[PDB]
């Protein structure tokens, strides 16, 4: 009876919005850093603005942290709070620095990978 399908959707919905946050910072030549806070004008770092534990299905992470746009970026949702099918699975959004484009890949069982994401 676990909610494996909606868990995947919820996990993706916690990281998908962050693509916009990342692009906006990079368009200014500011870096992005993990977590919450205020924009740091000394270092020119913009926080993602979301707590790592905002969604109790798991944890949000940024790599590299901080990220300046000159290397590939990942946003991961690690489903440590999920039920048995999804626990220990990770949804990764990867922004390739060479082209500025995003992809979504997941190590979930393929039945539960959300729309737009691949293995």
Contacts of 1 (CB under 8 A, 6+ apart): none
The beta-strand segments (E) located in 1-119 are 31-33, 45-47, 59-63, 73-78, 90-96, 101-106, 117-118
Domain boundaries, the chain: 1-119
Alpha-carbon span 117 to 119, nearest angstrom: 7
Helix (H) or strand (E) holding 13: helix 4-15
The resolution in Å comes to 0.8
SS3 at position 37: coil
b/e sequence 84-107, b meaning 16+ C-beta within 10 Å: ebbeebbbbbbbeeeeeebebebe
Reference 85, options 63, 103, 111, 54; nearest CA is 111
SS3 at position 19: helix
Tokens for 30, please give them: 């500011």
**What fold, for 1-119?**
Glycoprotein, Type 4 Pilin (3.30.700)
Give me the phi and psi of 17, to 5 degrees please. -65, -25
């Amino acid at each position: 009876t676990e909610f494996a399908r909606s868990e995947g959707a919820s996990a993706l919905a916690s990281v998908n919005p962050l693509k916009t946050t990342v692009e906006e910072a990079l368009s200014r030549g500011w870096s992005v850093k993990s977590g919450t806070g205020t924009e740091d004008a000394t270092k020119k770092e913009v926080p993602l603005g979301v707590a790592a534990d905002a969604n109790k299905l798991g944890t949000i992470a940024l790599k590299p942290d901080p990220a300046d746009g000159t290397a590939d970026i990942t946003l991961t949702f690690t489903m440590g709070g999920a039920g048995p099918k999804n626990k220990g699975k990770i949804i990764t959004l990867t922004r390739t620095a060479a082209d500025g484009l995003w992809k979504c890949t997941s190590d979930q069982d393929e039945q539960f990978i959300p729309k737009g994401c691949s293995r």
